Design a protein around this nucleic acid. Structure first.
Length: 288
DNA sequence: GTAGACCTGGACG
DNA sequence: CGTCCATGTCTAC
């Protein structure tokens, strides 16, 4: 899941668990049932703890907890989703982690491919340094300066997929959709973009991330599509107003764009076993 | 630049 | 059976 999906997940987790007391956390299958997460023993020794917040930056999510009788003792749960990670209020297929709160209340993290990660820390300083490794959140930061793009002689698609250089939160499908809307050839070097293209790009980044965030069932958040329709949406990018009422793929994994133009499944980024497919329509997206 | 890996499928032939 | 693809990210020549 990308930035918008992680942010919405955090919103739902806060709605149901902020203020609740976590009593236990179990890794019933997957990587962590085979080898425990960093800081796990330390953490379980300090439970029960109360959840004060569930926040996100880009595709990174974390829980902040503390003991009511020692507000100073703050603990954190670091979580990344990988390609198939998801949270749910019910024990879905592929459930890896089970969090037990007071009063029989439960939260579950499922992950088919086990690429998601968990880390437990008692250091606010370590979390801060972690957050500083990520660029500003494309969905939550309404005043990002993307003109920094002009300093890089690299394909714009690669710059937007990077989680530090310009901003954080964009993944394979969002970048493809954004570039199509902005009418920019994915191969174009950031150092060759005009100020007008940059202004345009910023607009569509805000448009697409907000649309994705406001959606209820784009696809990979099925275990919560029920909750997505029962919770509101924070007013990120307040001045941008998408017309569609649900996110839809214009080019990602499509043979043709909405108007019949051929879509190329291009291999631009990566090498070896990490190559990604970049979907774009040349009749629309130009280098100039 | 290049290569590999972690893991478990779904879709298609 | 077989093939390719998959909303992520890391490590090494």
């Amino acid at each position: 899941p990308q930035g918008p999906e992680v942010a919405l997940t955090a919103d739902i987790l806060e709605k149901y668990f902020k203020g609740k007391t976590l009593e236990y956390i179990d890794f019933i299958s997957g990587r962590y049932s085979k080898s425990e997460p960093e800081g796990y023993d330390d953490f379980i020794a300090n439970l029960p703890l109360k959840v004060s917040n569930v926040d996100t930056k880009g595709k990174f999510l974390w829980f902040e907890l503390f003991d009511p009788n020692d507000k100073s003792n703050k603990w954190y749960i670091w979580n990344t989703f990988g390609l198939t990670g998801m949270w749910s209020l019910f024990e879905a297929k592929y459930t890896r982690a089970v969090l037990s709160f007071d009063n029989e209340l439960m939260a579950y993290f499922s992950d088919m491919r086990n690429f998601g990660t968990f880390k437990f820390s008692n250091s606010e300083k370590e979390l801060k340094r972690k957050l500083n490794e990520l660029g500003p959140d494309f969905l939550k930061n309404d005043d990002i300066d993307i003109s920094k793009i002009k300093k890089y002689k690299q394909p714009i698609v690669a710059l937007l997929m990077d989680q530090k250089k310009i901003g954080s939160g964009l993944g394979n499908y969002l970048v493809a959709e954004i570039l199509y809307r902005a009418k920019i050839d994915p191969h174009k070097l950031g150092s060759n973009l005009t100020d007008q293209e940059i202004e345009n790009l910023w607009y569509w980044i805000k448009y697409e991330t907000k649309l994705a965030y406001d959606s209820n069932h784009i696809g990979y958040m099925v275990n919560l599509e029920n909750e997505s329709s029962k919770i509101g949406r924070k007013n990120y990018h307040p001045n941008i107003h998408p017309t569609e009422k649900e996110f839809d793929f214009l080019v990602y994994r499509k043979k043709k764009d909405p108007n019949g133009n051929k879509v190329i499944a291009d291999k631009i980024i990566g090498s070896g076993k990490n190559k990604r497919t970049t979907y774009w329509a040349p009749a629309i997206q130009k280098l100039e």
